[PDB]
C-alpha cells in the first residue's frame, strides 16, 4: 500500500503514476536519460509514511546522481524536478500566481520593497505579467537551480522557505532598475531587459540578483581604498574597510604610501597591514572564513623584501600577514633592471619627493627622479640585485599562487584616465578593476575617493552574431547606470567616486565555449583575430550605449578627467607590439564615434572590465569568464549531495575544447589577454598556469616564470592574478 | 584445514572423497541397517557435489578420534562474582577448542553501585579469558560482548575499542553488540532523552526489555519519574551518534533489535527469551546464567551449522531431500559430539537447535538476472526463503514423528501453533507480493500434533572457507570484485566468481550499489522465514558523498530502515577506501 504524509501532515495512499508523470514531463526533449533508472534508484528509498517533500528530494537527487559526460541531459531532468519542487514550495501548486497578486503579498510580508507598488499601477503589473515566460525555468541546468535556491531566490533564511521563482526575480529586477523611466519608454525597457537576462544573454552579480527588489540598498560588492601616510588616513582606511566588509564587499587596498620602518611608522608597514587584515576579518564567521582583500604596494618600497614573504608560513607571527593577498606594482624601469642584470634601489616613499606620483603618472619623470635619488647619497636607501628581488616575488607567487603583479605604467598609458588629474594607482581583490582613488582624512572626509565598480557580463555563448551586442550594451549600461542612482553609499568618499565618474565594469562569460564553437584554441594563436574581432565589437557598442546615454542624460560630472574627453580612444593607446600578433582590421567606425564622444561625452568613465565568474556562469551553464575549463565535468559539494555540471554542448564540442591543462604553456593565453586588453577600459583577471610534470624533475623553472612575466608585460597586460599549479 | 594430515611432518593421509564418505558414515552410523547405507549414499552425493556445505570443525574432525565440533557458543553472565567466574571459566574451556564466543554481560551492575568498580574491569577479564589460548595474546580466539543501550555505563562502553583512550578505558580485542528496542528509537525520532539505569537499580526492567515491550514501556517511564532511583540523562541523538561513530570507524560495534528477536521468534519470550547473539550476529537462542562452571541449572546455547548451496540446486523442490539430509545429519551430530560444560549439554539436548543457511546467493541472483540494490530480487527472495524454511520444518517434523520432538519443545512458539509466517514485521508486505506456495496450514497442524525435532532450523551465517570449497559467493554477500586474491606461502591464490564468463554483467558487485536500501530489504524478506538471525552488513563508499564523508543522517536512516523491515541484527560496517 505505502502510505505518504501530505504537504500539511497526515497520510494517504501512494501514487506511483503521479510521480511517473512528473518524471515524463521533466524528461521531454531530453536525450539519453532513463526515467526507469531514476525510478529504480528512488523508489527503493521510500518507506511507509514518507513525508511528501522527501519524495521530491529523493527523485531530484536520483536524477542528479546520474549526471555524466555520457548522459549530460540529466542536468536538465534534475533541474526541472527541482523547479517543480520549488514551485510547490513557493506557491502551493506548479502554476505561479499573477504578478500583482504576488507582489502585493510580498511587499505586505516585508520581503519586496514597497516602492514597486508605488512606481507601478496594477495594470502595469498585468502588462509585465504578460512579458513573463515561466517555462524559461525549464531551461536551467541542475547546478543553476542549486545556485538560485542557494543565494538568489528571496527566502526565509531561518525557516528555509522560498517565496519566489526565477522569473519573478528576473522581471522585478528589471522593474526596479528602470522604475524611474518615463511611461513612454519604461515598460519596453523592462521587457527587453527581462528577456536579455532570463535567456542568459546578460549576467548580473549576486548582490544585485538577490537584493534588487527587496527593501535593501546594499549592492556594492567591490571597493578600492587608497591610504595616505598618516595615522588619520590609516584609521579612515580601517574604518571604511570595517563598514564595507560588514556588507560582504571585496577590498582592494593601496598601502604603498605608508613610510618604511625606521623613518622619522618609525615601526613601519607590517603592524598596519595586520590592522587592515583584522579590519577585513572583523565580520567573518570566526576571524577566518569570508571577507577578502588584496593589498598593493610598489616593488621599490624599502620594506619590499619583508612584504613579499608576508603569506609564507615559515616565519614568526610578527613577520606574517597570511590572510590577505598582495599586488606587487612594477614598471618598465624595474624590468629593464632585471633584463640588463642590474640593481634595484629601494626607497621609503617618505624620503623621495615626487617619486611615488611619477611611478604611476609619468614614466620619464620617474626615470629622472629615480636616478637622481640613486646618485644622491644623503637619501636613505637599500640596494638589491634585480634578479634576486624578482626571484623572491615569483617564488612567493608560485608557492602561494596569490602574489599578484600590476604594471602601473600600462594602467596609465593605456587608460580612460588622464594620469595627471586622476591616475590609476591600485586594483581590486581580483585585479580586473582599475580606477582613480584619493586617500581619506577621516571616515567622512568629503575630499577622499573610494572607487566602486558596478559589474555585469555578456554571455558569448548565447548571442548568435556580434551585432546583437548593440541592444545588449544599451540594456547593460542603462540598467547598471540606473543602479548607481538606486543604491545607498555607506561612506561619502565612495559616493564621490561613483557619482563623479559613474564607472562600470562589464565583461564576458562563456569565452572558452565561444572559441570551441568557432573551432579555435587558446595555446596556438588560432584565436587572435577572432578575439580582436570579438572585443572590438564589445567595446565599440559599450561606448555607443554610454554615448547615446550622455546625449539623453548628460555626461558624467567628472568626464573632463578621462582621456576620452580629450578625444583619445583605447585604439590609440594600446601596447604597440599587439600589431605583431593579429592583423584583424577594425570593423566599426571608430572615427564617427570619436567625434560623437568629443561632442556629447560618455555617461560612464569606464565601461569594460573582465572579471572572474563562478556563480553567474553556473546560472546560465557557461564556462567561467575567459577561462578554459579544468575538465569536462565540474564537481561541487553541497549538503544536498555531489553537484555536477557538464561543459555546454560537450556532446558536439568535446574535441573542440582545449581544457586548461592541455595547454603546452601560457604564451597563447597571454596573447589573447593582450588582444582583449587593447579594448578593455579597466583590466582583466588573467591567470598563469603550470603543470610540473611538463618540466624536468617536475620543477617549474624560474627562467620560465620570468619569461611569462615579461611576455605578459610585452603584450600590454595590465595585471596578473592567480598562479595555478597543477598537482598529479 | 580439511584433509587428515600429519601436522608436524606435513604428510597428507586421505583424499577429499574419503573425507566425504566417512563423514557420512559417522553421522548416520547409528541408523538401522534398513535405512543406513542409503542415507550414507545420499549425503555423500549431496556434499561431494556441493549441494550441502559443512563447517570446518565437522569437515576436519568427524571420522577422527576427536569429539570437539562446537565452533560457536553463547554465554549469559549473571550479576555476581560466582557467575562472572563461571562465565570466565566456560570461555577458557571453549576457546581452548577454538570456538567463537558470544557473551551477554549487560546484567553486570554499573560502576559506583552498592562492581562498586563496575563493568570494564570485568570485560578486560573476559578478553584475556578469550585470548588465553591465542598464539601471543592476539591472533585467534574471538568474541562479541552484548549489553543494553540504556545501561548506565553505556557511554564508556561504546568507545571501548577506540584507540584514543588510556589503557583502563579500553578493551580493544573484543567486538560489541549494542541492544536496542522500539522505545529507544522513538526517543531518537521524537528528538527526546534516553535515561540510563544500572540494571541492579530497576527491578523487572531488564527482563521486559527482551520479553515484554509495553511492560518495558511502563517500568521505564515509572523509573524515569521516580527520582529516588540512580539515573543519567542523555540526548537520544547524541547517544545514537556516538554508537554509530564508533560503529563507522571500527566497523565492529553491532546492533541487536531485542524486541524483534522476541516478537518474531521460535521461542516464547516468557519462558525462554532471546537475550544475546553469537560472534557473527546470526545465532539467537535462549541462555541462562551460571552459578559455577558445572552448574546444571545454567544454559549455554550452542549452534550446529550447515548451508545450502543455491548455485548447485536446479529447482527449489530439490530442497526437500536436501533438508531431510542436512537436518538428520546435524541432529545426529548433536548426539555424537562431547560437551565440555554441563550447561552447554543442557542447551543442546533440551532444544536441539540448528542453524542451516545459504551460500552462493549472489551467484543465484545473477543467474536469475536480479540485483540487490533496486528491488528486483524481492519476490524471488521471498519465493526462495519460503521454500528453505518450509522444507526445513518439514524435515524436522518428519523426524519428530520418527524419533520424538525435542525435550523442551513446549517452550517454542511452534508448540503453541505459531509460525514465522504469523509474526514477521508487517511492513514486509509493502515491499513484496509473492504469495506463499507451500501448504503452511497442513504443516501448522502436523507441527501442533507431532512437534519439531529441533527448536530452530535456520540461521544465515557468513562463510569463507565453505564457499571457497564449492567455489561459491560467500553467504548472502555480493562479491567485492570478480576475482578474489588470497596470500599463502605457496604463492598468490586467486578465485574467479562462478561463471564469470556468462554472468559478468549479471553480477552486481558490492561497491556498485548506490546504497544499502535494496540489500537491507532482502535481509528483511529473508528474516520473515529465518528462525534465528542473519549476519547482515552495512556498506559505504566515501566517494559517493560530498567531500568523501559519510553523513550521520545516512547512517541513522539505514539503521532505522533495517529496523523497519524487521532486521534482527546488524553485523559489520564496511567502509571502502580509494
Amino acid at each position: 500500500n505505502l502510505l505518504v504524509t501530505k504537504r500539511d501532515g497526515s497520510t494517504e495512499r501512494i501514487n506511483l503514476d503521479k510521480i511517473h508523470r512528473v518524471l515524463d514531463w521533466a524528461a521531454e526533449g531530453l536525450h539519453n536519460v532513463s526515467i526507469s533508472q531514476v525510478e529504480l534508484r528512488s523508489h527503493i528509498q521510500f518507506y511507509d509514511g514518507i513525508k511528501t517533500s522527501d519524495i521530491h528530494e529523493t527523485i531530484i537527487k536520483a536524477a542528479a546522481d546520474l549526471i555524466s559526460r555520457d548522459a549530460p541531459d540529466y542536468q536538465y531532468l534534475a533541474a526541472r524536478l527541482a523547479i517543480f519542487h520549488l514551485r510547490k514550495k513557493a506557491y502551493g501548486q506548479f502554476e505561479p500566481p499573477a504578478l500583482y497578486d504576488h507582489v502585493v503579498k510580498m511587499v505586505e510580508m516585508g520581503k519586496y520593497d514597497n516602492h514597486l507598488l508605488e512606481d507601478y499601477t496594477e495594470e502595469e503589473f498585468k502588462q509585465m505579467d504578460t512579458f513573463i515566460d515561466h517555462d524559461r525555468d525549464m531551461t536551467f541546468s541542475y547546478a543553476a537551480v542549486k545556485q538560485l535556491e542557494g543565494k538568489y531566490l528571496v527566502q526565509n533564511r531561518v525557516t528555509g522557505e522560498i517565496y519566489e521563482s526565477a522569473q519573478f526575480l528576473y522581471i522585478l529586477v528589471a522593474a526596479c532598475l528602470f522604475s524611474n523611466y518615463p511611461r513612454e519608454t519604461r515598460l519596453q525597457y523592462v521587457k527587453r531587459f527581462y528577456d536579455a537576462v532570463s535567456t542568459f544573454k546578460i549576467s548580473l552579480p549576486t548582490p544585485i540578483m538577490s537584493g534588487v527588489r527587496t527593501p535593501t540598498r546594499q549592492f556594492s560588492s567591490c571597493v578600492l581604498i587608497e591610504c595616505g601616510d598618516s595615522l588619520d588616513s590609516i584609521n579612515a582606511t580601517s574604518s571604511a574597510i570595517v563598514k564595507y566588509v560588514s556588507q560582504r564587499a571585496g577590498i582592494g587596498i593601496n598601502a604603498g604610501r605608508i613610510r618604511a620602518l625606521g623613518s622619522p611608522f618609525h615601526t613601519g608597514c607590517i603592524p598596519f597591514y595586520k590592522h587592515f587584515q583584522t579590519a577585513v576579518k572583523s565580520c567573518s564567521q570566526g576571524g577566518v572564513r569570508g571577507g577578502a582583500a588584496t593589498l598593493f604596494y610598489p616593488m621599490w618600497h624599502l620594506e619590499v623584501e619583508s612584504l613579499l614573504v608576508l603569506k609564507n608560513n615559515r616565519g614568526v607571527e610578527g613577520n606574517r600577514v597570511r590572510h590577505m593577498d598582495y599586488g606587487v606594482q612594477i614598471n618598465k624601469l624595474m624590468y629593464t633592471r632585471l633584463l640588463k642584470g642590474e640593481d634595484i634601489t629601494l626607497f621609503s616613499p617618505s624620503d623621495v619627493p615626487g617619486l611615488y606620483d611619477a611611478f604611476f603618472a609619468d614614466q620619464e619623470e620617474f626615470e629622472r627622479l629615480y636616478t637622481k635619488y640613486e646618485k644622491d647619497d644623503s637619501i636613505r636607501k637599500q640596494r638589491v640585485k634585480a634578479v634576486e628581488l624578482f626571484s623572491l616575488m615569483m617564488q612567493e607567487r608560485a608557492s602561494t599562487g596569490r602574489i599578484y603583479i600590476q604594471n602601473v605604467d600600462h594602467c596609465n598609458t593605456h587608460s580612460p584616465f588622464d594620469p595627471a588629474i586622476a591616475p590609476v594607482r591600485q586594483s581590486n581583490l581580483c585585479l580586473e578593476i582599475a580606477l582613480p582613488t584619493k586617500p581619506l582624512n577621516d571616515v567622512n572626509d568629503e575630499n577622499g575617493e573610494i572607487a566602486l565598480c558596478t559589474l555585469s557580463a555578456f554571455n558569448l555563448g548565447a548571442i548568435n552574431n556580434l551585432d546583437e551586442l548593440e541592444e545588449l550594451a544599451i540594456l547593460a549600461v542603462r540598467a547598471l547606470d540606473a543602479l548607481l542612482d538606486y543604491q545607498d553609499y555607506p561612506i561619502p568618499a565612495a559616493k564621490r567616486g561613483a557619482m563623479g565618474r559613474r564607472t562600470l565594469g562589464i565583461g564576458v562569460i562563456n569565452f572558452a565555449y565561444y572559441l570551441a564553437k568557432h573551432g579555435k584554441r587558446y595555446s596556438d594563436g588560432s584565436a587572435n583575430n577572432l578575439t580582436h574581432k570579438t572585443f572590438e565589437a564589445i567595446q565599440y557598442y559599450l561606448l555607443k550605449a554610454s554615448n547615446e546615454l550622455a546625449k539623453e542624460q548628460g555626461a558624467c560630472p567628472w568626464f573632463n578627467e578621462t582621456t576620452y574627453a580629450k578625444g583619445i580612444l583605447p585604439i590609440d593607446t594600446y601596447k604597440k607590439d599587439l600589431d605583431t600578433i593579429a592583423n584583424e582590421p577594425l570593423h566599426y567606425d571608430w572615427e564617427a564615434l570619436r567625434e560623437s564622444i568629443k561632442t556629447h561625452g560618455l555617461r560612464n568613465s569606464t565601461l569594460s572590465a573582465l572579471m572572474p565568474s563562478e556563480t553567474s556562469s553556473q546560472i546560465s551553464n557557461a564556462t567561467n569568464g575567459i577561462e578554459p575549463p579544468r575538465g569536462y565535468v565540474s564537481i561541487k559539494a553541497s549538503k544536498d549531495g555531489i553537484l555536477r555540471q557538464v561543459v555546454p554542448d560537450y556532446e558536439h564540442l568535446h574535441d573542440a575544447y582545449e581544457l586548461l591543462w592541455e595547454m603546452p604553456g601560457n604564451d597563447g593565453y597571454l596573447q589573447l589577454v593582450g588582444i582583449m586588453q587593447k579594448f578593455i577600459d579597466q583590466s582583466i583577471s588573467a591567470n598563469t598556469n603550470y603543470d610540473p610534470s611538463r618540466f624536468p624533475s617536475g620543477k617549474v623553472p624560474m627562467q620560465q616564470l620570468l619569461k611569462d612575466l615579461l611576455t605578459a608585460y610585452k603584450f600590454g597586460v595590465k595585471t596578473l592574478y592567480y598562479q595555478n599549479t597543477r598537482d598529479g | 584445514k580439511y584433509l587428515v594430515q600429519n601436522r608436524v611432518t606435513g604428510e597428507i593421509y586421505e583424499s577429499a572423497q574419503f573425507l566425504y564418505i566417512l563423514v557420512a558414515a559417522c553421522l548416520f552410523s547409528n541408523y538401522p541397517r534398513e535405512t543406513r547405507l542409503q542415507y550414507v549414499k545420499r549425503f555423500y552425493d549431496a556434499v561431494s557435489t556441493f549441494k550441502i556445505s559443512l563447517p570446518t570443525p565437522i569437515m576436519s574432525g568427524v571420522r577422527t578420534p576427536t569429539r570437539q565440533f562446537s565452533s560457536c557458543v553463547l554465554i549469559e553472565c549473571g550479576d555476581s562474582l560466582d557467575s562472572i567466574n563461571a562465565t570466565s571459566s566456560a570461555i577458557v574451556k571453549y576457546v581452548s577448542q577454538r570456538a567463537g564466543i558470544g557473551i551477554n554481560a549487560g546484567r553486570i551492575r554499573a560502576l559506583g553501585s552498592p562492581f562498586h568498580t563496575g563493568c570494564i574491569p570485568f570485560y578486560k577479564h573476559f578478553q584475556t579469558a578469550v585470548k588465553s589460548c591465542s598464539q601471543g595474546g592476539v591472533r585467534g580466539g574471538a568474541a562479541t560482548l552484548f549489553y543494553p543501550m540504556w545501561h548506565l555505563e553505556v557511554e564508556s562502553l561504546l568507545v571501548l575499542k577506540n584507540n584514543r583512550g588510556v589503557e583502563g578505558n579500553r578493551v580493544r580485542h573484543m567486538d560489541y553488540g549494542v541492544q536496542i528496542n522500539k522505545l529507544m528509537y522513538t526517543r531518537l525520532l521524537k528528538g527526546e532523552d534516553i535515561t540510563l539505569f544500572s540494571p541492579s537499580d530497576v527491578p523487572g526492567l531488564y527482563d521486559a526489555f527482551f520479553a515484554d515491550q509495553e511492560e518495558f514501556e511502563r517500568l521505564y517511564t515509572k523509573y524515569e519519574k521516580d527520582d529516588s532511583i540512580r539515573k543519567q540523562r542523555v540526548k537520544a541523538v547524541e547517544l545514537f551518534s556516538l554508537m554509530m561513530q564508533e560503529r563507522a570507524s571500527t566497523g565492529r560495534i553491532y546492533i541487536q533489535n531485542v524486541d524483534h528477536c522476541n516478537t518474531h521468534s521460535p521461542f516464547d519470550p516468557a519462558i525462554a527469551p532471546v537475550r544475546q547473539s553469537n560472534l557473527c550476529l546470526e545465532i539467537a537462542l535462549p541462555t541462562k546464567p551460571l552459578n559455577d562452571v558445572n552448574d546444571e541449572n545454567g544454559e549455554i546455547a550452542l549452534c550446529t551449522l550447515s548451508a545450502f548451496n543455491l548455485g548447485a540446486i536446479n529447482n527449489l523442490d530439490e530442497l526437500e531431500e536436501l533438508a531431510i539430509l542436512a537436518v538428520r545429519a546435524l541432529d545426529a551430530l548433536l548426539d555424537y559430539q562431547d560437551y565440555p560444560i554441563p550447561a552447554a549439554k543442557r542447551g543442546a539436548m533440551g532444544r536441539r537447535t540448528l542453524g542451516i543457511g545459504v551460500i552462493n546467493f549472489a551467484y543465484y541472483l545473477a543467474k536469475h538476472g536480479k540485483r540487490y540494490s533496486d528491488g528486483s530480487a524481492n519476490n524471488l527472495t521471498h519465493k526462495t526463503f519460503e521454500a528453505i524454511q518450509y522444507y526445513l520444518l518439514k524435515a524436522s517434523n518428519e523426524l519428530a514423528k520418527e524419533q520424538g520432538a525435542c525435550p523442551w519443545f513446549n517452550e517454542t512458539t511452534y508448540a503453541k501453533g505459531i509460525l514465522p509466517i504469523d509474526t514477521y514485521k508487517k511492513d514486509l508486505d509493502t515491499i513484496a507480493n509473492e504469495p506463499l506456495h507451500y501448504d503452511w496450514e497442513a504443516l501448522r497442524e502436523s507441527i501442533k500434533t507431532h512437534g519439531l525435532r529441533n527448536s530452530t532450523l535456520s540461521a544465515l551465517m557468513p562463510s569463507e572457507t565453505s564457499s571457497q570449497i564449492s567455489n561459491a559467493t560467500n553467504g548472502i554477500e555480493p562479491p567485492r570484485g570478480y576475482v578474489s586474491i588470497k596470500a599463502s606461502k605457496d604463492g598468490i591464490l586467486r578465485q574467479v566468481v562462478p561463471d564469470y564468463e556468462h554472468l559478468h554483467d549479471a553480477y552486481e558487485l558490492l561497491w556498485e550499489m548506490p546504497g544499502n536500501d535494496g540489500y537491507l530489504q532482502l535481509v528483511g524478506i529473508m528474516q520473515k522465514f529465518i528462525d534465528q538471525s542473519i549476519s547482515a552488513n552495512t556498506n559505504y563508499d566515501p566517494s559517493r558523498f560530498p567531500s568523501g564523508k559519510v553523513p550521520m543522517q545516512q547512517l541513522l536512516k539505514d539503521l532505522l530502515t533495517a529496523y523497519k523491515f524487521g532486521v534482527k541484527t546488524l553485523y559489520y560496517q564496511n567502509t571502502r577506501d580509494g
Partner: peptide
C-alpha cells in the same frame, strides 16, 4: 571520517 550532522526534524517523519 564521518560528518556529524543530524536533523531531528528530517528523522521524525519515519514510521518505525
Amino acid at each position: 571520517q564521518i560528518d556529524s550532522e543530524v536533523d531531528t526534524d528530517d528523522l521524525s517523519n519515519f514510521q518505525l
